Amino acid sequence: TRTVFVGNHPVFCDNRIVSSKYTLWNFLPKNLFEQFRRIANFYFLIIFLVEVTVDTPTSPVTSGLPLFFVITVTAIKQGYEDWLRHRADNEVNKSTVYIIENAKRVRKESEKIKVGDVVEVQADETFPCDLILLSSCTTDGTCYVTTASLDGESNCKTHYAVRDTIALCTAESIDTLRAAIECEQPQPDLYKFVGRINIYSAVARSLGPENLLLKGATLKNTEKIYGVAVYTGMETKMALNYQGKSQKRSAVEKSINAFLIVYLFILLTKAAVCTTLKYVWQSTPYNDEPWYNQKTQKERETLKVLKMFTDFLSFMVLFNFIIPVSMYVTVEMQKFLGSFFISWDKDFYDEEINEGALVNTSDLNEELGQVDYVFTDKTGTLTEKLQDQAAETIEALHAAGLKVWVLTGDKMETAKSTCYACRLFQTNTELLELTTKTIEESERKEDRLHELLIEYRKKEYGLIIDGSTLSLILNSSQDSSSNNYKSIFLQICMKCTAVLCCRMAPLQKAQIVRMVKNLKGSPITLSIGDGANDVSMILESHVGIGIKGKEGRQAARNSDYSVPKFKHLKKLLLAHGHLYYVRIAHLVQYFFYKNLCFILPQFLYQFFCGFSQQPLYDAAYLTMYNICFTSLPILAYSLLEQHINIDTLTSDPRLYMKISGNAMLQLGPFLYWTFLAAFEGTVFFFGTYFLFQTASLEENGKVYGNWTFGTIVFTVLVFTVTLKLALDTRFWTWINHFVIWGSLAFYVFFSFFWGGIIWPFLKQQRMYFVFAQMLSSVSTWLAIILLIFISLFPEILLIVLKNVR
């Protein structure tokens, strides 16, 4: 189809690869649009604008500053990643290539090559495009090539020049011996090229994969070759097997979205119920304006339908704390500060390479504890002979409940021996081979798949698939719907103890991961490899792991985490991932629970005012509830807590199954926290409502007010939410003691300090001595102590019941 002239002499794109996503000029508009298209970010901006314009209990600076913080942090992280990819694009480009333009050896950059020009690759120098071998200056017309960036193997493949042009060295390949190469359109398959060359004096030789020198292949043991650029960048076989990086989201991150949507519906229902009840209550003429609080002429003149919308917006802002914007800030801090535990780990240190573990992203720490599938490279990853503890690591991963598949670009004879040596294929394991010997082209694969699924395995079995056969299964899966090749093959794969995929291509390896990612239920997939041949499957999986070995750092740069050794994956998943998931899953649940406990008493208070949107607590309490009172203890928990000891986590791999499937963020656990928060919030409000049913709570007969009521509720709430985390803590460090008891002691000290001085910078003194007068009554102390215990009784009963039987 495509016609190429050799010297571009009478008888397409340039090779500028683009791995980046943002341009310098369009980065901000493209990033802020993708960031504010998320429901949480859009909601936070809406709330910030409503506080700025319509109404706000507290300053609209505690609502818009954390949003700015998280937006800039994400923008900087993504911009730095894109800059890192740009830097690699400019080193692959702007590379010296020698092109023979007019009987002379011109020197250009790699990106300036056009389709149909003669390149002059030398020994131990990577090919700049998909060249067709015109001439090796030997008299044999054969060169040697190592395609370690396409299949990960370092053997010496042999290619053959075109016979009628084997004699053209000395920059004399422009000898008016021009030709017309008629090849096919570019395809990602490395081992299938069809085309012909029409040498004019016309001899027409049929070309094949033996003449095509692919980009990313090193020329070995040959001083110099001449070839024609047939395919350039973004159409080279190397670029067609690249795919690209998609936005990676962990299971905790997607559960946070569902939790936020549920609480958004809760917030909307609260606001709507409050507005409806407010305007039902105001229907009585003496309920609004009963001569003791009368409205201004402006409030009376305000349009009816506009005031309803304004009241709904005000109830929204008043109840808006149940979706915590501080949770996102805390999550970013925890994610950034938790990667240092992977970086600092001495069990990931290699004496030979003088390096440890490398963290490229901090947003996938919890995904290491949710892995369901492991996809492995074989050469350099599993083997050096075998690596240190390749078989022990696989045994540990199997004991953890994971499935280990080997995706390799090596041939089956050697790939299968490695799987037999790694104990992945046992002696009494019967192999179902779908390779090219058992398949005899035609539709025999149809018979093979039915014979293996319907009557062999649906009633010990290890599947072996070839790249060519996987090509048939995949490319020919969009023709039939009665019995899908892909579905039938995936059932066999799922029912097999291990799966070996040999003679694969870089894109075929990501295609397998995509198949598993799109199963019923969402398996979390892990990919590990050491070479650029494994970059595509690393960029496709939920968590990509690179290895710092002997094949470069292309896989270690495109990955999320890089470890020197494959045995290093046991601790990275069993201990680090487990702890990381358990910490953040507890943080999210606690953040939602402690903010629902904070706002439910304030929602119940509107039934006792005229639904007037009067806050139950002081503004200084509303502001620093999530900043000072209840901010540090949960952050310390999410960074230091070991519910199971690290030494135990590595020893027993069956503890990894307890948190599989996002177990701590499911409907049951979520409902437990949500109903506990509701029960505690109801207790907070009504225990002090019934307490306030007396003439006086003091020995001197003096009465309390609406600010003392709210201060009592706030004290009970703060102590209850702190003591719940204290009860949940299992790993009490000095830092945990410090934060947990210092938050409680700082609440009491700020209450005695903020209240107790008439502040010249305040326009109100509503809380001057409310806290100090509240603590002068023994009855109030007794009520607070009783309410804290009633609020924690369901929790104590649980730890009593589920610790026996």
Partner: protein, 320 residues
């Protein structure tokens, strides 16, 4: 190469408590053995408080105060006969109660100027706009601006012991009914030499006032912005049914002997325009305050649904 410190290797010393049903089981008894004596004690204490409520709204047409719902002369007087079955012994506190009065309304609560009531000179003649249905009257700032001030309770209540049938008055003291801190620090008078009338010079009285703030009481230490009756009302209530300290009947023979009594009221405060009622409360106190059985009943029931859980779980765990 990586620094082998306890913090960086996640091996800091930790307490690591274990809390199972062999160490958490025996607190359902320790709690049930303290909460029941406490609930019983604070329930007996509440029962020993002597209290009486008199509703003098006069809505029903068989009341002495029905004449003041819509009178011709605005200072009307009515007397409600009531009887104290058993005597009040210790200190006695008199309250007035209002129901369906939303002192916790969002619009009402902010209708004040705390700097103005703190004796600030720049705020006396420049009240805030939050107190502005009642900010300026007659082109002149209102000295106690706001709705909370404007709506101040203004009935006068007098107690007479009958006996003979010769009423003997009961001494009521108006000092010591507000918070010491908010009478002596939070509420201050404007600066001025000796006369309170000339300190409030460019200001005007509230529209519902019949006498300016410097004529609220003859005692110079209870005269204006520091009137304890004003301060008590300024402390807005939490619920639409509330009580406010009116007077103190000091301990002296009981403080309030059992017998017939008279409650002469100067019915000034209109509460019947909305569905509100007015009450007079005579009460004694204890260390726990007024009469409220909620705390006792709750402590007793919480220390009784703890001891039974402990009993029913210790037996259930003894099966092994």
């Amino acid at each position: 190469r990586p620094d082998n410190t306890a913090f960086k290797q996640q091996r800091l010393p930790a307490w690591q408590p274990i809390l199972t049903a062999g160490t958490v089981l025996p607190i359902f008894f320790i709690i049930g053995l303290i909460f029941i004596p406490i609930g019983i004690g604070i329930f007996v204490t509440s029962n020993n408080i002597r209290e009486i409520e008199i509703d003098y709204t006069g809505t029903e047409p068989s009341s002495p105060c029905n004449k003041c719902l819509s009178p011709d002369v605005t200072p009307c007087f009515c007397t409600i006969n009531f009887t104290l079955e058993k005597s009040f012994e210790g200190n006695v506190f008199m309250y007035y109660g209002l129901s369906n009065f939303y002192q916790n309304h969002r619009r009402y609560v902010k209708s004040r100027d705390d700097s103005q009531l703190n004796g600030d000179s720049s705020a006396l003649l420049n009240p805030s706009k939050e107190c502005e249905p009642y900010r300026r009257n007659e082109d002149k700032p209102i000295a106690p601006c706001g709705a909370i001030m404007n709506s101040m309770f203004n009935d006068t209540l007098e107690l007479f012991l009958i006996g003979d049938s010769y009423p003997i008055p009961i001494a009521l003291k108006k000092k010591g009914i507000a918070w010491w801190t908010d009478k002596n620090v939070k509420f201050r008078n404007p600066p001025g030499g000796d006369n309170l009338e000339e300190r409030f010079k460019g200001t005007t009285k509230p529209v519902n006032w019949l006498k300016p703030v410097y004529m609220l009481d003859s005692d110079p230490d209870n005269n204006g912005f520091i009137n304890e009756d004003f301060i008590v009302w300024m402390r807005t209530a939490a619920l639409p049914t509330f009580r406010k300290l009116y007077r103190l009947i000091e301990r002296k023979h009981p403080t309030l002997p059992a017998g017939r009594y008279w409650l002469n009221v100067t019915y000034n405060y209109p509460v019947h325009y909305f569905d509100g009622r007015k009450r007079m409360i005579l009460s004694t106190i204890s260390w726990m305050g007024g009469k409220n059985p909620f705390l006792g009943i709750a402590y007793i029931a919480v220390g009784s649904i703890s001891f039974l859980l402990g009993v029913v779980l210790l037996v259930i765990n003894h099966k092994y």
